[PDB]
Structure formats: C-alpha cells, structure tokens
Write an enzyme that holds these catalytic residues in place. Structure first.
Site, PDB file in Angstrom:
ATOM      1  N   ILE A 122      36.600  16.199  65.603  1.00  0.00           N
ATOM      2  CA  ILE A 122      38.145  16.332  66.204  1.00  0.00           C
ATOM      3  C   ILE A 122      39.021  15.434  65.800  1.00  0.00           C
ATOM      4  CG2 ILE A 122      37.176  17.658  68.173  1.00  0.00           C
ATOM      5  CD1 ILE A 122      38.793  14.747  69.230  1.00  0.00           C
ATOM      6  N   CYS A 123      38.754  14.691  64.876  1.00  0.00           N
ATOM      7  CA  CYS A 123      39.391  13.541  64.308  1.00  0.00           C
ATOM      8  C   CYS A 123      40.194  14.250  63.148  1.00  0.00           C
ATOM      9  CB  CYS A 123      38.357  12.131  63.754  1.00  0.00           C
ATOM     10  SG  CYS A 123      39.413  10.871  62.977  1.00  0.00           S
ATOM     11  N   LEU A 124      41.262  14.561  63.376  1.00  0.00           N
ATOM     12  CA  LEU A 124      42.148  14.960  62.518  1.00  0.00           C
ATOM     13  C   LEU A 124      42.395  13.922  61.185  1.00  0.00           C
ATOM     14  CD1 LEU A 124      45.976  15.272  63.177  1.00  0.00           C
ATOM     15  CD2 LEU A 124      44.682  13.473  64.058  1.00  0.00           C
TER      16      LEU A 124
END
Lengths: 27, 167
Positions: free
Chosen positions: B115-117
């Site tokens: 979820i770490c863009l």
C-alpha cells in the site's frame, strides 16, 4: 551548519514513557 | 498541486535530528523520543484544527505501530485499520504499512510496498531522507495514498460506507 529557520521537534527534556502515554491517550 | 502539498506538509511537521535503529536500546529511546514529539505535535495541530484523518499509537518498545484512519466524501464516512513494524536495520528506503481492512480489496502489489504508493513518494523520500520519520512517512505516503484511492475505489466500485451496516 545551523538551521535556525527550519522547524525543530518539541524536545524539552520529556521522557519516552510520557511521550507515548500522551500519544496513545490522545486517540 | 502535488509538489506544493508535499512542501506544506514538511513546512508544518517539525524536523528531527537522530536517525538511529531499534538495535540499540538507548539510541532507540533518543530517536523514538524525537519521533514521538514531532508526530504528537503534528496530530495535536491537525486534530485541534478539526482536520483529523488518521490516529497512530505504538507499544512501549516502539517496535510495532498501529492505528486507524477515517475519510469523508459524498457525505459518507469510512474507516480503515493500519499496523506495521520497524525493521531492525531502519534503512534509507522507507518502511512499509499494511492495512488489514483492505487486505484483499486492493490487488496483491509487488513484494515490497503493498500500500506504499511509489509514484512520487519513493523518489521524494529517496532524494530527501535527512531526518524524515514516521510523521513525514504518513503525511507524504499514507495521506496521498488515501486521497488517491478514496475517489478511485469509490468510482471503480470497491469501497462503500458503513453507516448503513449499523445505524
């Protein structure tokens, strides 16, 4: 190299336990 | 308006100095202390301005971090949970957050950054990671991710509101 104009943490001799205590308590 | 949001956020978040890892008990207390002070100041300000979007707390050891976030759009309200652990080496490459609420909604991303863009956050962090800590990570990673995913996931049809599940 000083950085007087840059922001700096609210470090006023607080203790870790107190820091995390107010943190979790704040919700 | 991406680079300006990024600059404002760092312009309001107070900067740290220590960059230590949890490996050393004492060094960790110091590093952790500055991180807490910076993050507490940020959330105090943010929440006081009735602009709260996230909530984050950690164990007495500061190894594992957990929290929740809420977003509002189209007069609807949503909630999400978050829980991550800091690597013992604490490298120049930012940590990784996990969201169990969305575990299965969002596709299984590559191994390293579920979820770490990375779009602007990865180059931003890599170019500037002087004293950046978790406050900076969330406000320049979790914040934009949620602000990008809420509108897209709603129009695409993945998320919904939960008022209707209760009252």
């Amino acid at each position: 190299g000083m950085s007087v104009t840059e922001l700096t943490v609210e470090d006023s001799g607080e203790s870790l336990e107190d820091l995390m205590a107010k943190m979790k308590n704040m919700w | 308006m991406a680079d300006e949001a990024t600059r404002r956020v760092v312009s309001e978040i107070p900067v740290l100095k220590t960059n230590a890892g949890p490996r050393d008990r004492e060094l960790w207390v110091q590093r952790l202390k500055e991180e807490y002070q910076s993050l507490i100041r940020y959330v105090e300000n943010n929440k006081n301005a009735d602009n709260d979007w996230f909530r984050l707390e950690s164990n007495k050891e500061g190894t594992r971090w957990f929290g929740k976030c809420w977003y509002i759009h189209d007069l609807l309200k949503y909630e999400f949970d978050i829980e991550f652990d800091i690597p013992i080496t604490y490298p120049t490459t930012a940590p990784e957050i996990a969201v169990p609420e969305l575990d299965g909604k969002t596709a299984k991303m590559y191994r390293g950054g579920k979820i770490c863009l990375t779009d602007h956050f990865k180059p931003l962090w890599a170019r500037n990671v002087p004293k950046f800590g978790l406050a900076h990570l969330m406000a320049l990673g979790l914040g934009p991710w949620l602000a990008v995913e809420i509108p897209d996931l709603i129009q695409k049809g993945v998320i919904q509101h939960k008022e209707k599940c209760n009252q």
